[PDB]
Design an enzyme around this catalytic site. Structure first.
Site, short mmCIF file in Angstrom:
data_model
loop_
_atom_site.label_atom_id
_atom_site.label_comp_id
_atom_site.label_asym_id
_atom_site.label_seq_id
_atom_site.Cartn_x
_atom_site.Cartn_y
_atom_site.Cartn_z
N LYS A 1 -30.02 53.08 12.57
CA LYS A 1 -31.12 53.95 12.08
C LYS A 1 -31.31 55.19 12.95
CE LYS A 1 -32.08 51.76 8.42
NZ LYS A 1 -31.83 50.35 8.77
C1 LIG Z 1 -21.42 51.37 7.59
C2 LIG Z 1 -22.62 50.82 8.29
O1 LIG Z 1 -22.76 50.92 9.51
N1 LIG Z 1 -23.52 50.20 7.52
C3 LIG Z 1 -24.72 49.59 8.07
C4 LIG Z 1 -25.77 49.30 6.99
C5 LIG Z 1 -27.15 48.96 7.54
C6 LIG Z 1 -28.29 49.02 6.53
O2 LIG Z 1 -28.21 50.23 5.74
C7 LIG Z 1 -29.67 48.98 7.18
C8 LIG Z 1 -29.83 47.81 8.15
O3 LIG Z 1 -29.64 46.57 7.50
N2 LIG Z 1 -30.72 49.01 6.13
C9 LIG Z 1 -32.00 48.37 6.38
C10 LIG Z 1 -33.05 48.73 5.35
C11 LIG Z 1 -34.13 47.87 5.12
C12 LIG Z 1 -34.30 46.59 5.87
O4 LIG Z 1 -34.27 46.81 7.31
P1 LIG Z 1 -33.75 45.70 8.36
O5 LIG Z 1 -34.28 44.36 7.88
O6 LIG Z 1 -34.36 46.15 9.68
O7 LIG Z 1 -32.24 45.75 8.36
C13 LIG Z 1 -35.04 48.24 4.14
N3 LIG Z 1 -34.93 49.36 3.42
C14 LIG Z 1 -33.91 50.19 3.62
C15 LIG Z 1 -33.83 51.43 2.79
C16 LIG Z 1 -32.94 49.91 4.60
O8 LIG Z 1 -31.91 50.78 4.77
C17 LIG Z 1 -24.38 48.31 8.86
O9 LIG Z 1 -23.37 47.67 8.50
O10 LIG Z 1 -25.14 48.00 9.80
#
Ligand SMILES: CC(=O)N[C@@H](CC[C@H](O)[C@H](CO)NCc1c(COP(=O)(O)O)cnc(C)c1O)C(=O)O
Ligand SMILES: CC(=O)N[C@@H](CC[C@H](O)[C@H](CO)NCc1c(COP(=O)(O)O)cnc(C)c1O)C(=O)O
Lengths: 428, 422
Positions: free
Chosen positions: A199
């Protein structure tokens, strides 16, 4: 110079391709070490601790009344729904194009996700399609600020208030972005952020933040993240679980790391915003290439850059856009540009949403006997966007990536200087 | 000397009371920083390294690292097909997480009373709580004492129930020489900072001999996706999942802690044995014990106090509990309670609102008052017991526990004052 795919030099030399993210400085290392040695490693640690410090600093930077640090962005979303009384028998409208967590959060709180199509330019939930999908069961809307672009909060908040619905902003991909000069996350009833390592303001692993102007909502999330218990610094604990809670506690070490990242956030923002603007200005000159844009009265966080490609620009009118998408991905990857996809299908095509088994016995769908679309049935704009788009992830987030993005632009210009070869690959 | 409660010198001097837990060494700091600089922060990564090391050390077929011990329990239930309309029997005396894990998987927790000496779920009471809806039992190895796994597994086999061991408080504990966590269908461990093998914050491990169960938990912890190293993420989800991922830094820290576990464990076993030997001689003091053919992890030391020993017949056991707590704390022994009420008394299980509209209870029609008997043993144990937490876990607490024993012997040398306060 010649295309790398046909033996020419790659526009991006291999020694320029690697980008470190998160960007770890000595300040980050010391924050982590100090957190270890501080002997206050958990959210529930009595007295001042890195978790409560991050909550105060995040609230302060972005002007939020309340910030509750939690395990994940997903937990922030599900706890927000619980705090707003969303649960069994309720529907939550979410975009058909997002990270799966946006669609799962309603299921996690035993509510039914209802998917609305997205805008072909903004990639955000289309308020025109939200209105269509409201029923007697709708309780909430989760607009996503997808890729870092704030959603149409004018029309999403207007729809919600016209229908008596809650609004939870999924701001995971858009920290620091504004809508009418208001920090995203503070416009809905509540806002969710992810601090996951990919992020824009990352932690060294997993993390989430729930923000709100409502004290009662904040207190509900505070209880929800720690087994339903009231835990207040200095105040006497009663070890009572007042309602349904989870272990959604943030780690102190991760909190301390993000506090260090937050101190440099706007310095990194300044570099990113200059670098991405310069990059998109070059690509915007290429026919049939749509660069991503901030909607009116918004700024873009540029978490992910999504480009749409027009087959008509390469004389491929009538050929599946996926053919051009594949040809461009191959040629750009050969130049050393790590062009990707982000989501291969709209969320409603995911097995979890098609099968409607959930926890078992079809719950949460079983409460009302609610159904959903079959795979491939609905959401043509989400499908069209996936069909003709490639994304750039990670590399543009680093403040030193200015020269790298100019090398990417060199690569795009090379590919666009060889339209016959693009057309040949697409047609093969 | 006079009691500290009435101006006397404390048996435990102020400058000797502090105990660091977790015990952070330079090896721990280096492991965390190396994980940070390694640039593999999510889960040749520290999470899979910990999974391999934990499985190898304790002889499990499979180990899946997750966010928390609570997530280990809820993912285990999901993997074993426990869900809406199902009942899960758990102890009336445990950490709240044991009672909540069934609710997290939209199943109904059913509370079995505990043993008056082992503090673990009474197999006879488990049998009485079984209905047509029972799908699983979560025996807890409470305080580090392995539960009656022979009887629990026998009951489970008879009624076709799943068994998930809550081994959160019992790392290294054994039952008939077998590592706890490997006896049931699956075992849940907590690496929370207070635990015998801690991480620097939150962490959980799910162990099992069943490859399919492990794979279910592996997908469940990461949004239902299959994430293989070197493969580009396609975001294809194969069922209902959560974000229950362990942090790489926390995994690296626990891997460092594991290299000293055997040495720390030896010290704890020796120190606790010597401490309890002295306290066992005090009349109306019942030291905690391992059941026959088990070994205790000694995560928490729970003591039962008999009013009869201070001639306080008629006086509520809570009155003696309060008096002893005041006197022992004054001497510098940080005596606590662990749980103020049986889990069935907790508002969350009384109100039966859950997610809303009474779910998960609404599915089974358990809206009205709880079915079956009260839990008098859980209540009796809470009424007359105090606990020692944390201080005895440190390998160098030998001298501190010596001073604790001085404090106990000193309080017992003033039975008139105990009786007066009680
Ligand atoms: C190639 C590449 O690096 N890809 C990424 C992809 C990560 C993915 O987009 C991220 C982390 O999972 N999205 C998290 C996320 C969440 C939930 O958050 P969380 O529960 O804190 O995860 C809710 N909403 C939206 C819009 C979100 O984007 C990797 O493989 O890590
Ligand atoms: C004076 C003192 O500090 N005391 C502690 C006590 C802590 C408490 O016993 C710990 C918290 O981690 N127990 C967690 C736990 C879990 C869940 O694991 P998790 O999800 O990994 O937490 C499941 N099962 C059992 C038996 C458990 O004990 C405080 O009150 O904080």
């Amino acid at each position: 110079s010649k295309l790398a795919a046909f033996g020419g030099p790659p526009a991006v030399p291999r020694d320029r391709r690697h980008v470190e993210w998160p960007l770890v400085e000595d300040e980050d290392r010391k924050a982590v070490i100090d957190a270890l040695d501080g002997a206050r490693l958990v959210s529930n640690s009595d007295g001042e601790n890195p978790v409560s410090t991050l909550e105060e600093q995040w609230a302060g930077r972005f002007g939020f009344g309340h910030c509750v640090a939690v395990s994940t962005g997903t937990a922030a979303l599900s706890l927000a729904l619980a705090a707003l009384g969303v649960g069994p028998g309720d529907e939550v409208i979410v975009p058909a194009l997002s990270f799966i967590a946006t669609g799962l959060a309603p299921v996690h709180q035993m509510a039914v996700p209802v998917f609305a199509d997205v805008d072909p330019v903004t990639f955000n939930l289309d308020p025109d399609d939200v209105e269509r999908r409201i029923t007697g069961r709708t309780a909430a809307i989760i607009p996503v600020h997808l890729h870092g672009a704030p959603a149409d909060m004018d029309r999403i908040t207007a729809i919600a208030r016209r229908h008596g619905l809650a609004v939870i902003e999924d701001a995971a991909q858009a920290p620091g972005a504004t809508h009418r000069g208001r920090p995203v996350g503070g416009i809905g009833d509540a806002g969710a952020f992810s601090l996951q390592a990919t992020k824009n303001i990352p932690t060294c692993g997993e993390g989430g933040l729930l923000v709100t102007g409502n004290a009662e909502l904040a207190e509900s999330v505070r209880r929800g993240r720690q087994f339903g218990e009231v835990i207040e610094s200095g105040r006497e604990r009663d070890y009572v679980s007042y309602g349904l809670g989870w272990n959604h506690k943030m780690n102190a070490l991760q909190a301390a790391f993000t506090s260090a990242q937050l101190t440099r956030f706007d310095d990194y923002e300044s570099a990113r915003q200059r670098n991405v603007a310069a990059f998109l200005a070059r690509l915007a000159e290429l026919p049939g290439l749509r660069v991503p844009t901030a909607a009116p009265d918004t700024t873009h966080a540029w978490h992910i850059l999504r480009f749409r490609f027009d087959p008509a620009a390469f004389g491929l009118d009538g050929v599946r856009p996926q053919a051009l998408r594949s040809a461009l991905r191959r040629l750009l990857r050969a130049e050393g540009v790590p062009m990707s996809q982000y989501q291969l299908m709209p969320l409603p095509d995911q097995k979890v949403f098609v099968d409607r088994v959930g926890f078992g016995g079809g719950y949460p769908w079983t409460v009302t006997g609610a159904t959903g679309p079959a795979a491939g049935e609905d959401h043509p704009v989400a499908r069209a966007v996936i069909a003709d788009s490639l994304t750039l992830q990670k590399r543009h987030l680093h403040p030193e990536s200015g020269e790298l993005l100019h090398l990417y632009a060199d690569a795009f210009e090379k590919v666009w200087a060889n339209p016959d070869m693009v057309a040949t690959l697409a047609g093969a």
